[PDB]
Write a protein that binds this ligand. Sequence first.
Ligand SMILES: [Zn+2]
Lengths: 50, 107, 209, 50
Amino acid sequence: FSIGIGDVTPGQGLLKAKYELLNAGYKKCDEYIEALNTGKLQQQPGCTAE
Amino acid sequence: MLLFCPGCGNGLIVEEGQRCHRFSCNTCPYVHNITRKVTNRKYPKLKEVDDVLGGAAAWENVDSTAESCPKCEHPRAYFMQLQTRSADEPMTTFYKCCNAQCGHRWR
Amino acid sequence: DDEEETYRLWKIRKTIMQLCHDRGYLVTQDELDQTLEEFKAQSGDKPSEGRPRRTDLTVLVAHNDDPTDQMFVFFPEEPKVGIKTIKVYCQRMQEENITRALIVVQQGMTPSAKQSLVDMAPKYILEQFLQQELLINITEHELVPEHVVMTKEEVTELLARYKLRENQLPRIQAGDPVARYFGIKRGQVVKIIRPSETAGRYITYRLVQ
Amino acid sequence: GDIIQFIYGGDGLDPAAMEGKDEPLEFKRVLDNIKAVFPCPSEPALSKNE
Ligand SMILES: [Zn+2]
């Protein structure tokens, strides 16, 4: 019973999902910071905009 | 607002010793006679008025319109709002709800 | 205003009378459910109501053992009680030849009176409360387990069971809210029945000291 | 020699000996064990009243 770097290398589908997810996440983060700096952001009902 | 004497540059004080009030120095006889009114204060200081009328106080302030909750929408919480600090800063709104065994009070 | 005041009056009367019921004095069931509108019927609005005299009550007696033992309840009006008013109460007391009375203060009283409250007489005892306490009955609260004072025979039996000497019992402070509520002096013993998390029950005892 | 408690912990039971969640026994688990160790083929099955 052993462990090597074959047990850690990422496969094929993983790279696609990771790339897809990162792109979507950054866009949504962009959308939020755009919302704040324009001041159009709706404030969450427990705190201020920050 | 503050004043200093043109003649000597120290702060003025307010006093009355004749038919009309006067702005005067304490080191030189320069004085100005106030015939008119000036309109700016030092913003005095008294602490938080919380329980002025605590508890189920009088019912004259009742009102018609009120909001509603997003989750349950039971029949008992009419509106109220409040203030922050002083004469030149905003006022705040809180939506507190309370039946039992929870912790809700929305901002 | 004058409706919150009457609400306070109603609540404090409810609580005081409940306290007297719990000490075991004469009280009538039809008073227990005296509603706030019933109070408004028996007593008018604040501007027409004389605080220092409208709510005074002395019908209570120790019927449980002595119908000839009567007691007093008084509701002073001044924010801080003075020597003259307690002297007026004590001379009224002497005219009625009674040993015990209750005192309620809206805010407080002079320290001179505080000193006097210990030395009226061995035969005259006066118990002081604050309005902001009796506005709730602590005995009704959920964190307060049921206290039951018990007679000399019961304590004799208890400390005969465990071979104790009475001083080995855990203590309850003389000035504690519940003890002061039940009006129990030093050397009495109180049974506590704790509500278990389950249907079971636990019992414990404490000595007033 | 002054009392702190009249009985240890209100129950008198020992915290280390608790097979349940602060209760000394799990009834369903003790019953099933009895059923599995003592199969009594001869005896007839019982009814609510019996
Ligand atoms: Zn000058």
